[PDB]
Design a protein around this nucleic acid. Structure first.
Lengths: 142, 258, 187, 124
RNA sequence: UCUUAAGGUAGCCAAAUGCCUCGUCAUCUAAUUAGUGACGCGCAUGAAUGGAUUAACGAGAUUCCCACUGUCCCUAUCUAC
RNA sequence: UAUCUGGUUGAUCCUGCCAGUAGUCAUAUGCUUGUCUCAAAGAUUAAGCCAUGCAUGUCUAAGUAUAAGCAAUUUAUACAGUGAAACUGCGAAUGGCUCAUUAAAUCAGUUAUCGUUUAUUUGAUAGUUCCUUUACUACAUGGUAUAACUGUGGUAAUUCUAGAGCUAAUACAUGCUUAAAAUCUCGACCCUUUGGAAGAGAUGUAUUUAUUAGAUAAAAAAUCAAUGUCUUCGGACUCUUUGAUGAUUCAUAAUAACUUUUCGAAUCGCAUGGCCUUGUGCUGGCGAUGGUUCAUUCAAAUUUCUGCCCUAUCAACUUUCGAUGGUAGGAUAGUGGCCUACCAUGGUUUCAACGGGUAACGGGGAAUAAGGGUUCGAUUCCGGAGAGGGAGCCUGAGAAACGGCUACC
RNA sequence: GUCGGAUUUCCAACGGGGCCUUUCCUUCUGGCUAACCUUGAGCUUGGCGAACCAGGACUUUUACUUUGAAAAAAUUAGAGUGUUCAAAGCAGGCGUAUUGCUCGAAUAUAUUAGCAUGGAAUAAUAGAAUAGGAC
RNA sequence: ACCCACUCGGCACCUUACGAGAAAUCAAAGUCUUUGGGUUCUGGGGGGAGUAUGGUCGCAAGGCUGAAACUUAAAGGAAUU
RNA sequence: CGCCCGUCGCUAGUACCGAUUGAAUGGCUUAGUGAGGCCUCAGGAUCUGCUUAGAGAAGGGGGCAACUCCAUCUCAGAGCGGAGAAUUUGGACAAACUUGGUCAUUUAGAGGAACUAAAAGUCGUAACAAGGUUUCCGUAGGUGAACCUGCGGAAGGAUCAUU
RNA sequence: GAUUGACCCUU
């Protein structure tokens, strides 16, 4: 995302009005927020130029409910990625487990740069698309 | 489906009504009111089973519409009016006042009090907001809204209200070293003298609660309910003082005072 | 007859879900407003729990806000010029949210003359003093002056005519202007 | 509609239908205690197995367990209420080894013959 | 055993080869000496006098179906010579 | 009740099954059948078809009664009715029944609505307004007519029904009485630069379009384009709070401030206490609900996380434009490809996707063990679905309702 | 010592709270003023924090394993209970008998899952190596 | 190059049982009711039947995968007299 | 003097194949039709109200006779809000149907081919002994039938053995 | 190493 106005519509945060009258430093305003639950807002989200109405910090979504983590398996989707959640399912009769997994798709804000294999944690929000319901809050792998 | 239910089957009512699963296919469904469906005791069951003053439903309705009963100082001529917890049921006939509180084991017990005590009631606030006309108000556990509360009353504190007017007679804050009454879970009916609480950023705060006998448990914040300061309580408690003495002790004291 | 559930859609894996329920009252949809210009006509629809919804059809006048000047007035619309959703909407001159329309700007010109006293395009001493005091801040930029001389202001509608029956909007100023005007002149 | 009324069986048939020794024992027991059917023996053996299972499951728990102490106290209390266990011996051997003979000889029909009110078991 | 050396094997069939014959059964039709599939003591099928099968091809013979229509019901009109 | 027995051989040890044995709130059937209690009972095949009879209608002291319905009281000619009916209300969306469909679908436990609606219920009362504006009108008060009451419409008919003499609305629009502080403004003047007396419109939310009070933790330096509290020009700026949660554009109000204007009581019952410049006037209580509306709840809808039987004689599946996410919009009560325009082959998959089957509704849950448990769960409780099958919708808080309507076999 | 709840020299043992053994219970700023440098002739005015709160930070990640809503309703045995005993439901019981009073209907959670909590054995890609490692 | 101690890795052999097994026999077929080192494949009475059918490979012969209906009280394993 | 195998013959049953563009049921459909309800520009009733000029009529009024006949009810022409029941402009939901593309699904079928059974059928004698050619495996060919033969293999052999 | 093929009834 090199250009923030590459789309037909004008990408702008709702209700964030910048007065043209003054001509000083920081002539444009950006709205962020504290996502809560101890997750620190990255300086990239603080000072970026993207809009991403679905961002946890600079967007209108509120993070509440489940907090999950996993390694990303696919990043080829715009502003959203899929993480792999590996877990062991217990089976009483045989008294042992089996490797199971669930691919959950989550929304990645432009504040974070992630790549395949990175472990990220996500927090539940309102339904963002047909399948996405979680937003990334931290990248924990290099 | 297609609309809110009006019937209530037996074996679907809350167990703490101490109903009999036979002798009837239905149970008296509490109506919408001040308390929840599950944590309420309808006047029908209160007058037919707790008090036996009315033998059946026709007599229950006869009493209520004959206007011998006032709940929270108001008659509430409804056969299954939801009478929950901390509320006072006054009967001018026999001049007898009850406070609906859980017993030691979590069943709404008969708790006779005098007129002085039945004047008021305690209630934990549910939230503090700024309603219409910019008026600050608190919504309590009873469904009551109190207008123009003092700025220092916050969430989980309780208010003692005279039940006659809108005046805020008294309140108890929430802090370490405060007596509570646990309403919900295994410990429905125990007295607290709390020590501290765990925050657990995210939801479902809990408090650690040690009774008089140094027996300590955990109970959720939404399940806790303070009813006074350390030592003297703001209301009177029923027989046994709600301490959950184990069943061996139960048989011990029964065989003692048989 | 339009429905609004997900049970009619293929599963996230691509599986064809089976028919579970009949279409449900609580997940219905309704026909698009496709509200237009001229001869204001509002139709009321009764929804879940009353909650009257004003479906706009052929609206005429709307309430537009100049946020910088902190003003708002009723004004008739001259037609749409660009739509992020669809150019067919622009051709049909239909009204939706976030649509760019033209306005005749006459009430805004009158407000400017009454509140500042600066001429556009081509007396008591006290009122003159008040105007001179409010003055020296009438030089925002050149495109606003050019548009006001042209007598047609570009503004985007922020309301939902098919939801409320009102085509309320706000005039473009700043980066949205510098974006939409270059989009229109880019051919 | 109405809540169901729970009903439970009170007896159990032997796993082997024809055991000569078991048939001799049951016939002798019923003849000496005046029973009309082997269903009475089956019922008493059923309750005996029930209480023996209860005792074994009680001994399962660790010593000085509150549930073990309470439940054993209740079981021994009912056993001494029916009057079979010693009033001065808490040794529990009788508890682990109650007998069908004990249960029938405690039963009412033989009580009359024991105290001497009918002088015959069948007359009782 | 006899004529005359051997007795028709594998296959195929009322077959372009079966008289009896419009064979018998099934199917196709409202109705079928037609068609196809079976059955074979087959007048008189049959193995380079080649047997059986076979994709593709065929101005080859045959049956049915869809489309189409003056073949027909049942004819009428027009043009050129 | 941690148990075995008979059958291959002339006989013998064995894997190995057959049979026996004992249970089944599993069913059927045969013979028999005297007492005490609760008793399942057209589930299995046909969620096949149904004659009939019934199963949702209902009012108080408190909406309308002037019915050729009824018996009528009296030291009041100062207002006691009951009431077969029919209009406005409310319910009929609860019950009850059946498993047909449905195998990440229902469902179970746990989450979330900071992503939404919610009739009744409870606590709570709504003074800011004549939007042609010191009068274009009734506030000891309104305007409109189908419902009742009397002949007629079709044959074998039905919960079919029309134009007349009438009637109040709680059936439907417009309207009003509060001279209780105050901001934004239009404007006679001294001829600016501490300025000031005169007359009138907005101040509730339904659209959320602009800033905010909506902060939050320490010491020195002054000339501004646009002056506040201040008053001994050398007397200071400290008071700029109207908020809990982890998180917000969350929770009031002001300089802008719209509309076809649901509304801001043109409502019914019950014993008259007090004021008089003496009226069929003035002041004062106990009871019922539409309606700005704000909070668990009866609720509903979406909604996390994990978990479902058989099958690979199902290995690749998802498509011109939904199968993929993003941007904007519409529709919803609300989020969301639920759908529309452009942008990729994005998403799932041997950790079994997709497909097929189920004589599969799911769960709570019978029958055994301190652990082998294998089946079954149509069925008394909870969540679903359906009312012959599909589809569509009105009213309604709530329905895709089928004992409600609109269309075939 | 009370005609078997009576525990001092109790020297026969312990997860966990503290000390030495190279072996500490997270910054830096504060409010009660943080396990205390501070004798008022006999429950204290300032050195250091986490055993509540403030903000950046880490149980890099688990699996695992005791403690509380977790299978909303009857069961599992019951202090007790005569429906003819019993299956069963939760009844029931006692007066100086004209009065009247009252115990009680709780205890196991039916796999896996999500929560908070103590623990470190049992299995590590992760650190810092051609130093874009730590104060 | 042979001869002798003798390690190591192979093909195998030689007498009770430590043990195993139904036995024949086996230094593995042992360390398995005193039952768990890791892992793959296969079997669940005899037949029907390695058949039918559907795939798949093959020029074909056939290979791999692979049933049910139905029938059946034995069929089998060690040679004890 | 045991046992035993296969063809052939008799009887019944079972499943399999099978021409029949076989047929009957429910899912999605390239394409083409399409009922009903729902959203949308427009034609038609009626009672309501303000006004200065045109008729028939229940006391013609300032000199009671040429001039205003009194909102008192009646009649066409000037301006507007409550029914958008005959279509449809554009639509959407979407009931009801074809030649063709599947479900181990169900089901008819002339005929074909195999398997299964019981006390006494015919022909041979293939196996069990060195079963009289050791048996058996794979493969190929042949033959009334078991089976025979070639090639390679095994011992489960009739050899655990050569100096 | 020839020709010896066959033999209907029960634990």
């Amino acid at each position: 995302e090199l250009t923030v106005q590459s789309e037909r519509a004008f990408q702008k945060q709702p209700h964030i009005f910048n007065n043209p009258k003054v001509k000083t430093s920081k002539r444009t305003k950006r709205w962020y927020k504290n996502a809560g639950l101890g997750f620190k807002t990255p300086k990239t989200a603080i000072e970026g130029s993207y809009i991403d109405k679905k961002c946890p910090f600079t967007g209108l979504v509120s993070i509440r409910g489940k907090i999950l983590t996993g390694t990303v398996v696919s990043t080829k989707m715009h502003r959203t990625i899929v993480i792999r959640r590996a877990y062991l399912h217990y089976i009483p009769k045989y008294n042992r487990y089996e490797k199971r997994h669930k691919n959950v798709p989550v929304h990645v804000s432009p504040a974070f740069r992630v790549q395949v294999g990175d472990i990220v944690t996500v927090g539940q929000c309102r339904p963002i698309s047909k399948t996405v319901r979680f937003n990334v809050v931290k990248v924990s792998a290099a | 489906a297609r609309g809110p239910k009006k019937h209530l089957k037996r074996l679907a009512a809350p167990h703490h009504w101490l109903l009999d699963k036979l002798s009837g296919c239905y149970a008296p469904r509490p109506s919408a009111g001040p308390h929840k469906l599950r944590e309420s005791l309808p006047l029908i069951v209160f007058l037919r089973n707790r008090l036996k003053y009315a033998l059946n439903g026709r007599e229950v309705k006869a009493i209520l519409m004959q206007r011998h009963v006032k709940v929270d100082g108001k008659v509430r001529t409804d056969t299954t009016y939801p009478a929950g917890f901390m509320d006072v049921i006054t009967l001018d006939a026999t001049n007898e006042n009850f406070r609906l509180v859980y017993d030691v084991k979590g069943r709404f017990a008969v708790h006779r009090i005098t007129d002085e005590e039945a004047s008021y009631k305690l209630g934990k606030v549910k939230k503090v907001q700024l309603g219409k006309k910019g008026v600050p108000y608190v919504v309590t556990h009873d469904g009551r809204t109190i207008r123009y509360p003092d700025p220092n009353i916050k969430v989980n504190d309780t208010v003692k209200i005279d039940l006659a007017s809108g005046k805020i007679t008294d309140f108890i804050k929430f802090d370490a070293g405060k007596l509570v009454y646990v309403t919900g879970g295994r410990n429905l009916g125990r007295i607290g003298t709390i020590v501290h609480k765990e925050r657990h950023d995210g939801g479902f705060d809990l408090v650690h609660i040690k009774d008089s006998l140094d027996n300590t448990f955990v109970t959720r914040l939404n399940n806790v309910f303070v009813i006074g300061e350390q030592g003297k309580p703001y209301i009177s408690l029923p027989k046994g003082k709600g301490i959950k003495l184990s069943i061996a002790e139960e048989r011990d004291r029964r065989r003692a005072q048989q | 007859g339009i429905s609004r559930d997900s049970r009619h859609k293929r599963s996230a894996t691509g599986a064809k879900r089976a028919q579970f329920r009949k279409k449900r009252k609580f997940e219905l949809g309704r026909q698009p407003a496709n509200t237009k210009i001229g001869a204001k006509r509002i139709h009321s629809v009764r929804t879940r729990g009353g909650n009257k919804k004003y479906r706009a059809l052929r609206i005429e006048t709307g309430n537009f806000s100049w946020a910088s000047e902190g003003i708002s007035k009723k004004t008739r619309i001259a037609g749409v010029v660009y739509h992020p959703s669809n150019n067919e909407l622009v051709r049909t001159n239909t009204l939706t949210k976030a649509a760019i329309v033209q306005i005749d700007a006459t009430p805004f010109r009158q407000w400017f003359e009454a509140h500042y006293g600066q001429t556009l395009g081509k007396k008591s001493k006290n009122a003159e003093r008040k105007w001179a005091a409010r003055a020296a801040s009438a030089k925002i930029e050149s495109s606003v002056e050019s548009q006001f001389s042209a007598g047609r202001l570009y503004a985007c509608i922020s309301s939902r005519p098919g939801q409320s029956g009102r085509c309320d909007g706000y005039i473009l100023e700043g980066e949205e202007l510098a974006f939409y005007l270059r989009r229109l002149t880019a051919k | 509609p109405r809540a169901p009324r729970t009903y439970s069986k009170t007896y159990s048939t032997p796993k082997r239908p024809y055991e000569s020794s078991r048939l001799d024992a049951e016939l002798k027991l019923a003849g000496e205690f005046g029973l009309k059917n082997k269903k009475e023996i089956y019922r008493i053996s059923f309750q005996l197995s029930k209480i023996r299972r209860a005792a074994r499951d009680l001994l399962t728990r660790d010593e000085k367990d509150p549930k073990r102490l309470f439940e054993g106290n209740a079981l021994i209390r009912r056993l001494v209420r029916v009057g079979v266990l010693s009033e001065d011996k808490k040794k529990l051997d009788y508890v682990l080894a109650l007998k069908v003979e004990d249960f029938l000889e405690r039963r009412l029909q033989t009580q009359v013959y024991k105290l001497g009110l009918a002088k015959s078991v069948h007359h009782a």
